[PDB]
Design an enzyme around this catalytic site. Structure first.
Site, short mmCIF file in Angstrom:
data_model
loop_
_atom_site.label_atom_id
_atom_site.label_comp_id
_atom_site.label_asym_id
_atom_site.label_seq_id
_atom_site.Cartn_x
_atom_site.Cartn_y
_atom_site.Cartn_z
N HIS A 44 0.63 -1.13 -0.35
CA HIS A 44 -0.21 -0.01 -0.31
C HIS A 44 0.80 1.34 0.33
O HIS A 44 0.42 2.32 -0.41
CB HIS A 44 -0.87 0.10 1.09
CG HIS A 44 -0.77 0.45 2.71
ND1 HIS A 44 -0.11 -0.31 3.42
CD2 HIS A 44 -0.38 2.02 3.19
CE1 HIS A 44 0.23 0.54 4.11
NE2 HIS A 44 -0.03 1.37 3.85
N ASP A 93 -0.57 -7.38 1.69
CA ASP A 93 -0.29 -6.07 1.68
C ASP A 93 2.00 -6.28 1.58
O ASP A 93 1.83 -6.21 2.84
CB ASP A 93 -0.94 -5.22 2.73
CG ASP A 93 -0.40 -3.76 2.69
OD1 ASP A 93 -0.03 -3.84 1.68
OD2 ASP A 93 -0.29 -3.45 3.92
N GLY A 186 2.66 6.33 8.96
CA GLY A 186 3.97 6.72 8.26
C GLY A 186 4.92 5.19 9.11
O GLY A 186 6.32 5.19 8.52
N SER A 188 4.08 2.17 8.16
CA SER A 188 3.07 1.34 7.06
C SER A 188 4.92 0.72 6.29
O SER A 188 5.92 1.32 5.64
CB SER A 188 3.09 1.79 5.93
OG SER A 188 1.30 2.41 6.22
N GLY A 189 5.47 0.08 6.56
CA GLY A 189 5.55 -1.58 5.73
C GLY A 189 6.67 -1.36 6.66
O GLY A 189 7.99 -3.08 6.14
C1 OTW Z 1 -0.28 1.90 9.64
C2 OTW Z 1 -1.36 1.78 10.47
C3 OTW Z 1 -1.74 1.37 11.05
C4 OTW Z 1 -2.47 1.51 12.39
N1 OTW Z 1 -2.28 0.42 12.97
N2 OTW Z 1 -3.08 2.59 11.88
C5 OTW Z 1 -3.04 3.06 11.44
C6 OTW Z 1 -3.61 4.51 10.58
C7 OTW Z 1 -3.93 5.46 10.41
C8 OTW Z 1 -3.19 5.33 9.12
N3 OTW Z 1 -3.25 6.29 7.89
C9 OTW Z 1 -2.26 4.38 9.14
C10 OTW Z 1 -2.17 3.14 10.54
#
Ligand code: OTW
Ligand code: OTW
Lengths: 238, 238
Positions: A44, A93, A186, A188-189
């Site tokens: 993503h 993902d 932020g 993510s990944g």
């Molecule tokens: C990556 C991510 C993890 C999480 N546990 N909550 C999130 C919430 C919002 C977002 N944009 C990313 C998220």
């Protein structure tokens, strides 16, 4: 990372920060070194990314302040997105970045071992989520790489908390019932890293959640062990 | 800008965004076009800036998203800081940027007139503060140039609200008694623009305040009319 603390330099040496240069340079996502030419990250992260030319991978970073126009980085030769990926909340993902050059391993940058299919039975009790992401839903990218220790929850329990979703066996969840510690925008990944029998294993990839660190809303991660065959397939030469 | 709204493209054509390229590129401060080669801004913006080489001035911008590696900008040949400047809260918070090249004026980029010493008697009733700064104390840089209409307050009134400071006649204050609209972090150096007799005048330079938009804490601005002699002196050739 919500409710985390500053990392010790190089204590997560598989952790990279993936930047985009468009329109100006900024952190996009986390990722993990898994091979000399290979980063494992979340599919993503590449929404609207039309070319690998705009990507830079930085290894051996604690503080984003270390990254300047003169800081060395790894170019991306290829982005490999799982062919079943549609969106984070539906699973799959997972993505690979094939680097233009190879990483010379050192104390500050080295690969994390993938989980074994035989470890599916293991109860990981020492798991950490890491990144430069937000400390709360509406926030901004953080300078110092943050860490938080978070317990895994069962998929049965996770499904209870996400009644409008299908939490599959290709996902893994982690969080406290009371919330307070979690990945956020932020992160993510990046890795969900678990230490078992003195070895760090890449158990999860930070994927999604409803809000960040909310009570009764575990973070959801890609269940990496379900993709070891895919990773092998995709990381072979021609 | 706290409590503001999105600007119409080019409605503040003297407004620039000053970026630093170190360590990576980001908005630093606002500024105002006052001559073909001259930006007027705040001295405090240059804390730790050791060379004008790391600065880029972008004119004709509404959204920060317009700024990419391929976007045209003006280099800075010289930073001129008032020789009495020590810090924002002590006054003299004024600086000039001499550009490497000249601005070709157009509907999206043109200079704002300086106030006249004879306008010292004028009651400006149509004043606006503008910028890409924070919407609250702990926030981040905003994409779309924000605007807020804010009434001037008397220096006597301003002094009442800042009992630990000396609010001098070289400062001008603006704000609502109840707060809610104000400059904030990242708006520094931008204009306080007042329209009088169908002409926009550069009345103030965004300088400091205790918090952002708090009740009984007017924003403090450099009183530009007190520096028209200095500006003339510094903008002459050799
Ligand atoms: C990556 C991510 C993890 C999480 N546990 N909550 C999130 C919430 C919002 C977002 N944009 C990313 C998220
Ligand atoms: C520039 C500025 C103006 C204001 N009125 N309040 C502020 C508060 C904090 C900060 N860093 C800058 C501010």
């Amino acid at each position: 990372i919500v409710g985390g603390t500053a990392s010790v330099r190089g204590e997560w040496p598989w952790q990279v920060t993936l930047h985009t240069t468009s329109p100006t340079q900024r952190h996009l996502c986390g990722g993990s070194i898994i091979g000399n030419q290979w980063i494992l990250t979340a599919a993503h992260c590449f929404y609207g990314v039309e070319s690998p030319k705009i990507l830079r991978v930085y290894s051996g970073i604690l503080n984003q302040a270390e990254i300047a126009e003169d800081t060395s980085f790894f170019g991306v030769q290829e982005i490999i997105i799982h062919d079943q990926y549609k969106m984070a909340e539906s699973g799959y993902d997972i993505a690979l970045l094939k680097l233009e050059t190879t990483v010379n391993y050192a104390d500050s940058q080295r690969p994390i071992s993938l989980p074994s299919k035989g470890d599916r039975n293991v109860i990981y009790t020492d798991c950490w989520v890491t990144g430069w992401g937000y400390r709360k839903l509406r926030d901004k990218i953080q300078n110092t790489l943050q860490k938080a220790k978070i317990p895994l929850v069962t998929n049965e329990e996770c499904q209870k908390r996400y009644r409008g979703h299908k939490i599959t066996h290709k996902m893994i969840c982690a969080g406290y019932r009371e919330g307070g510690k979690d990945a956020c925008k932020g992160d993510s990944g990046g890795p969900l890293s678990c230490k078992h029998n003195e070895v760090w294993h890449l158990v999860g990839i930070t994927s999604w959640g409803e809000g960040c660190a909310q009570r009764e809303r575990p973070g959801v991660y890609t269940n990496v062990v379900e993709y070891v065959d895919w990773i092998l397939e995709k990381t072979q030469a021609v």
